[PDB]
Design a protein around this motif. Sequence first.
Motif, PDB file in Angstrom:
ATOM      1  N   UNK A  25      -2.867   7.606   9.609  1.00 46.72           N
ATOM      2  CA  UNK A  25      -1.460   7.430   9.952  1.00 46.72           C
ATOM      3  C   UNK A  25      -1.190   7.788  11.405  1.00 46.72           C
ATOM      4  N   UNK A  47       0.847  -1.183   0.000  1.00 48.01           N
ATOM      5  CA  UNK A  47       0.000   0.000   0.000  1.00 48.01           C
ATOM      6  C   UNK A  47       0.886   1.238   0.000  1.00 48.01           C
ATOM      7  N   UNK A  48       0.497   2.235  -0.789  1.00 48.87           N
ATOM      8  CA  UNK A  48       1.364   3.373  -1.085  1.00 48.87           C
ATOM      9  C   UNK A  48       1.054   4.545  -0.164  1.00 48.87           C
ATOM     10  N   UNK A  49      -0.206   4.695   0.215  1.00 45.57           N
ATOM     11  CA  UNK A  49      -0.625   5.844   0.987  1.00 45.57           C
ATOM     12  C   UNK A  49      -0.183   5.756   2.428  1.00 45.57           C
ATOM     13  N   UNK A  50      -0.426   6.843   3.170  1.00 45.31           N
ATOM     14  CA  UNK A  50      -0.106   6.834   4.602  1.00 45.31           C
ATOM     15  C   UNK A  50      -1.186   6.200   5.456  1.00 45.31           C
TER      16      UNK A  50
END
Lengths: 105, 69
Positions: free
Chosen positions: A64, A14-17
């Motif tokens: 996050x 997964x790329x997002x925070x």
Amino acid sequence: FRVVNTASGDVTEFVGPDVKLAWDKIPEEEIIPEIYYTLEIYDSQDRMLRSVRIEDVYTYDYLLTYNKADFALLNSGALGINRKLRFRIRAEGENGEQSVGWATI
Amino acid sequence: TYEVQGAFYDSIIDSELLNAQIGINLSDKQTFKMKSAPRITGARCESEPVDVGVGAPIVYIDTTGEADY
């Protein structure tokens, strides 16, 4: 039950925070009365972070901030983050439980 | 001289995380000495070495530094 922020090449990545975690409505909810989905978050080395009761929302967000502070200083006890995470949910109501859906991911 | 360490950071690393350096993979340490500017030390003028006539005025300058040009 999947994360819509997953990297294109790798599902495990997964790329997002924040984990854009979303699932599907249980098809028999309409007959069933008010329902709540219990979401349990598992840390690395099998530890469990929290069990969050979610109702009326089918897309959960793990901000996050939660990874940074909710459990870096609670379980680990030090400033840090967790990368390898396991997610899994269930669909249960009052006066009963549905342990078949407890098994996820 | 300065020692440099660098590392890429993804969207996971916040400002506090960046400051703490915890969530990032630091690279190897590279050390370099910063160069010195050119400074002139002496000036002189000499006649052009020639067989006949009068040589043109040639000016010499002596310097120390690191500038390529």
